[PDB]
Amino acid sequence: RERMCMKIEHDCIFEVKHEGKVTGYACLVGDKVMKPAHVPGVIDNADLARLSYKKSSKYDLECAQIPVAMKSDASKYTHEKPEGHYNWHYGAVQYTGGRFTVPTGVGKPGDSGRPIFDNKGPVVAIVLGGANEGTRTALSVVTWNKDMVTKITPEGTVEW
Amino acid sequence: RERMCMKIEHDCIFEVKHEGKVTGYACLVGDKVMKPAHVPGVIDNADLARLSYKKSSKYDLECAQIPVAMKSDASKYTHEKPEGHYNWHYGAVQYTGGRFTVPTGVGKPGDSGRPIFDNKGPVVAIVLGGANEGTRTALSVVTWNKDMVTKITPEGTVEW
Amino acid sequence: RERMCMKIEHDCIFEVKHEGKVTGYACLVGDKVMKPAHVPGVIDNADLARLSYKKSSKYDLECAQIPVAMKSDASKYTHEKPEGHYNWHYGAVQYTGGRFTVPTGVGKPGDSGRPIFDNKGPVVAIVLGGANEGTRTALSVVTWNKDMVTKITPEGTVEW
């Protein structure tokens, strides 16, 4: 379950810096580069911080377009999502009923920006923060239609 | 052929930066530090960018004088040059008739600033850009007399 | 490397005294006796301090002519100097490019007047003081043409 995943984040993860102290993460998906605008900071690369950004606080997301040099270094993606096992940086996640789950407390504050996958390779979606549960946690993810983006935010959460 | 060369560039090569993106290279020869002024940028060191520079666009070169701290870290050099085999960062180069040669396409744009040697150790000269040939390439080098510097530029070249 | 050198300075070295305290050295070369006039003092011999002296502070040197008694006790000398290994009182010195070198700090203040040799026997030249380097030191020597004497003094030195 880890033998397919591990190569990907080495290709596709930058993170953010503010005052020489990492806090968030950043991804590069498809054609547009991604940042969850909740955390303050600057990306840890020389040039592409010089870029245009389009912000709406209604979703708390942020994109820009990748310049043509490292454009061929992003993952694949789709919208087809039957229920079943899926995977991430700290194990395997289950999903059904419009509800994502993983057991208790294996995520921390200071950890936004973690993409989540399938088995057969494309990237799926992207996490925000957590919510108390008793046993198996609630998530906070933004995702896609065939055509549109959408937030879902269940009750009783904390914004990481 | 590489067992004598490899230690040298680790001692004697800095390169240039502009917007956190390397493009050229820089050498330190004898008493005066060298830069081919074709490429824009700043050297990748703290202090010696604070230096005086003397520019003539007639040659497209640039020098300054090395401050006394790391003055004993430059190579040796001479002007005596019979025809025969010589060497560089990507192999062995042949020279005769005032004409330098190496086979096809093993050099790229974004590669100015590569010094070239002899067998017995001193540095010889310094490259600028390329020219199409069919099989074995033409070069673009500036070099030395007993007393003077000189450019040679054969027909049908591209300034790297 | 020391098996040829050692007999020579016993034949050819007097030193200077001032207030019963040695500070410099003195040589006897060819036809004219030599003293670097930087240091004050008197030579440590009875008679030849009674001699004529010709001084120019432009070079900071001093000569006189040897009286005929111990005239046959001076070394040999020449001006032919290809680059290569040479030798002195504290080891072996390297020379090229008009630049003499030896590694760090094996010379002190209070040490002017040390002649330097070849392999095959004649004396070559004569030292003045030092200069900081990082690793392998800079020298301060006066030397000869076919016909003329000449000083060379690189930047950032201290007169021993």
From Swiss-Prot, chains A, B, C:
Interaction with spike glycoprotein E2: region residues: 54-59
Segments for region (Ribosome-binding): 1-12
Localization (cell): Virion; Host cytoplasm; Host cell membrane; Host nucleus
Region feature (Dimerization of the capsid protein): 82-92, 118-122
Site (Involved in dimerization of the capsid protein) location in chain: 86, 119
Cystine crosslinks: 12-27
Active site: 38 (charge relay system), 60 (charge relay system), 112 (charge relay system)
Domain Peptidase S3 span(s) in chain numbering: 12-160
Residue interval(s) of motif Nuclear export signal: 43-53
Domain of life: Viruses
Entry remark concerning the domains of this protein: The very N-terminus also plays a role in the particle assembly process. The N-terminus also contains a nuclear localization signal and a supra nuclear export signal (supraNES), which is an unusually strong NES that mediates host CRM1 binding in the absence of RanGTP and thus can bind CRM1, not only in the nucleus, but also in the cytoplasm. The C-terminus functions as a protease during translation to cleave itself from the translating structural polyprotein.
Subunit structure: Homodimer. Homomultimer. Interacts with host karyopherin KPNA4; this interaction allows the nuclear import of the viral capsid protein. Interacts with spike glycoprotein E2. Interacts with host IRAK1; the interaction leads to inhibition of IRAK1-dependent signaling.
Role, per record: Forms an icosahedral capsid with a T=4 symmetry composed of 240 copies of the capsid protein surrounded by a lipid membrane through which penetrate 80 spikes composed of trimers of E1-E2 heterodimers. The capsid protein binds to the viral RNA genome at a site adjacent to a ribosome binding site for viral genome translation following genome release. Possesses a protease activity that results in its autocatalytic cleavage from the nascent structural protein.
Listed name of the protein: Capsid protein
Record organism: Mayaro virus (strain Brazil)
Residue span relative to the full protein: 99 to 258 of 1242
